[PDB]
Amino acid sequence: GSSGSSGQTAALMAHLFEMGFCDRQLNLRLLKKHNYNILQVVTELLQLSGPSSG
């Protein structure tokens, strides 16, 4: 399973859970991609879901 100090992942992941995102698998990928940039992590998610594709 996951190893290492508590870290600062749950903190961010939480926000998403509240906002309206229940995908811990998705967020993670973003967290370790946009330096845990809640903004970038969210802004991106919003794009994926919705008629806004092209």
Distances (CA, A) of 19 to 4, 24, 39: 27, 13, 12
Decide if 12 contacts 24 (C-beta within 8 A).
Answer: no
Q: How far is CA 44 from CA 2, 9, 14, 23, 40, in A?
A: 25, 18, 17, 13, 6
Domains of the chain, first to last = 1-54 (1.10.8.10)
